[PDB]
Design an enzyme around this catalytic site. Structure first.
Site, PDB file in Angstrom:
ATOM      1  N   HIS A  32       0.811  -1.214   0.000  1.00 63.99           N
ATOM      2  CA  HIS A  32       0.000   0.000   0.000  1.00 63.99           C
ATOM      3  C   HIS A  32       0.846   1.266   0.000  1.00 63.99           C
ATOM      4  O   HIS A  32       0.287   2.362  -0.129  1.00 63.99           O
ATOM      5  CB  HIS A  32      -0.956   0.004   1.199  1.00 63.99           C
ATOM      6  CG  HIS A  32      -0.288   0.241   2.519  1.00 63.99           C
ATOM      7  ND1 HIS A  32       0.111   1.493   2.938  1.00 63.99           N
ATOM      8  CD2 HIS A  32       0.029  -0.609   3.523  1.00 63.99           C
ATOM      9  CE1 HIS A  32       0.655   1.400   4.139  1.00 63.99           C
ATOM     10  NE2 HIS A  32       0.618   0.135   4.516  1.00 63.99           N
ATOM     11  N   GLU A  56       0.786  -7.977   1.832  1.00 62.10           N
ATOM     12  CA  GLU A  56       1.265  -6.603   1.768  1.00 62.10           C
ATOM     13  C   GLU A  56       2.785  -6.509   1.739  1.00 62.10           C
ATOM     14  O   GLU A  56       3.324  -5.398   1.727  1.00 62.10           O
ATOM     15  CB  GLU A  56       0.714  -5.797   2.945  1.00 62.10           C
ATOM     16  CG  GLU A  56      -0.777  -5.545   2.838  1.00 62.10           C
ATOM     17  CD  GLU A  56      -1.259  -4.477   3.788  1.00 62.10           C
ATOM     18  OE1 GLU A  56      -0.412  -3.768   4.370  1.00 62.10           O
ATOM     19  OE2 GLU A  56      -2.489  -4.350   3.963  1.00 62.10           O
ATOM     20  N   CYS A 141       5.462   2.980   6.992  1.00 60.41           N
ATOM     21  CA  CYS A 141       5.290   1.704   6.312  1.00 60.41           C
ATOM     22  C   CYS A 141       6.372   1.515   5.260  1.00 60.41           C
ATOM     23  O   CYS A 141       6.784   2.464   4.586  1.00 60.41           O
ATOM     24  CB  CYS A 141       3.906   1.626   5.673  1.00 60.41           C
ATOM     25  SG  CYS A 141       2.573   1.499   6.879  1.00 60.41           S
TER      26      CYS A 141
END
Lengths: 174, 174, 164, 175
Positions: A32, A56, A141
């Site tokens: 993402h 992910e 992230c």
């Protein structure tokens, strides 16, 4: 020092977050965080890059070495249960933040309403998973989880989610 | 094709914003987006880097070339008044936004409570300067202002401030 | 979400999702050898063409992530609108264009009707691939869409925004 | 306004700005050739040494950017406080430490006093270093961070640590 500078230099901005040069040609990040509107990564057109997504976790193998300064690093599909890993966070301010995290089992949970899978980690910083000064932020992230296997450093995954309730983070794996 | 992919490639994330590689060793950006806590800019310690700050414009000349893939480019102090330059914004999503900007006088403003200076620019987007989709965001600071003098591209400065309520923007120069 | 996400590749050009069920585009951008638009048989899509302004009302909401925008038939004469050009390079290009009167003009050997616009803008000009991109201005707090790019006179200054 | 900016080098270690005019650090970290601290002659500084804890109240506010913070004499037993380590490498290392009883620790033929704690990292190199002395221990009470002291020493194993506080608390003598 929890992380040599040769490991901090591997962490670089990518899209809405960060990513880690496992090797001169291998680059791991969070799915993402990828800039989905981009036509090139690190100067290489998309079609020339081998993109492998495991949940992910995202692995990018480039046709030619991009970061000749880095060496090939060991990549483990998560850490052993109870391993105290270090989430190496870089911030736009330039700050380096080694956040200790006790790595647990692999699980899936709803974080933002999306269902995220990966190895569970419990931050050992004294704060909740979401704290600007003492925890993670959404922009973190892609930053790597690292631990020391003997004399070697080992990336077990990248930061993919931080639960809002407590010290629970998710390390996207393999 | 406002800017060739070789010009968009020069625009790279830097701290809280972006920066522009004028040559393999030249890197311009906004002062207030510099990562202040970082000991190294692009792997090179800030102590070996020649940093020259003129207003909110920052130039960095590195000891050895890093971006050997980009040729030297013309950097001049602002553009002739009335020139239609292009603010080449990159977004963390990977999108590219070339916003037309008619460059005006050099002047100073009160922006966000601080006094900023540079060449004024009226966005020819048809929208506000601080529009989310059709204008600039605070995270666009450091992106370049580039116009084409004849057959040569000419960078004139970096975006450093966007006024609220109208198309006015500030290109820090020198 | 971003208004640009409403501008999607369509045939030889682009199109704009005004609402989750309304899609405006240029006729000469419409594919010929296709009986399915965004996953719906044509005969079940309500297709209305006014000159070069095509509108597609779909049976069910295709784009549930977008709000309902105000679609008016052109802008008031003299209004400075924004032509939202999306390019295959990933470039998102808002061009200022002052909208004027209705115009019928022979461009590229074809009589095109719409509202005329004058671009106020090295190469920041229109391309044939831009046709279908939306013309939009802001009235108060409301973004109004007035039509889609259908033609561009040589010189890249005068443009035609199909309407109605 | 980051709390890490309140942690600054001081002598051979670090120190923490509790308020614009209040600074805390470890006693052994202070340079013995002290003519001035942060541009203020020592005579003008109000200094309180309680064992390994050193408090400096300056005549005028020095750190006008920081806001006043609550300083407590230790944390309740069982509190998971945070040792905010700053390293010259630029690393900001928050270490969780479960705080316990107040105690003295034998070290270098002497005794160091403070609220003891145990790092949640147990026994890769996420431990303290002597250069960390002076870094603050904090814990979140309500929605406000509370500083409880500064790091002064660790046991040989590096897991037990001593957070030097404003001072030891004795038993009241009533009547």
């Amino acid at each position: 020092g929890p992380a040599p500078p040769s490991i901090w230099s591997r962490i670089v901005n990518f899209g809405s977050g960060w990513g880690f040069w496992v090797s001169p040609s291998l680059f791991i990040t969070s799915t993402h965080v990828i800039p989905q509107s981009a036509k090139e990564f690190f100067g290489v057109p998309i079609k020339q890059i081998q993109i492998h997504k495991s949940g992910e976790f995202c692995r990018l193998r480039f046709p030619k070495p991009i970061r000749t300064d880095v060496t090939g690093m060991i990549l483990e599909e998560g850490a052993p249960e109870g391993t105290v890993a270090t989430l190496l966070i870089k911030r736009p301010t330039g700050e380096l933040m080694p956040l200790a995290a006790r790595m647990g089992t692999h699980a899936t949970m709803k974080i933002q309403g999306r269902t995220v899978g990966g190895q569970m980690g419990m931050l050992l910083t004294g704060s909740n998973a979401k704290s600007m000064d003492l925890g993670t932020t959404p922009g973190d992230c892609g930053c790597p989880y690292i631990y020391k296997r003997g004399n070697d450093y080992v990336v077990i995954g990248v930061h993919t989610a931080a639960a809002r309730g407590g010290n629970t983070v998710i390390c996207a794996t393999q």
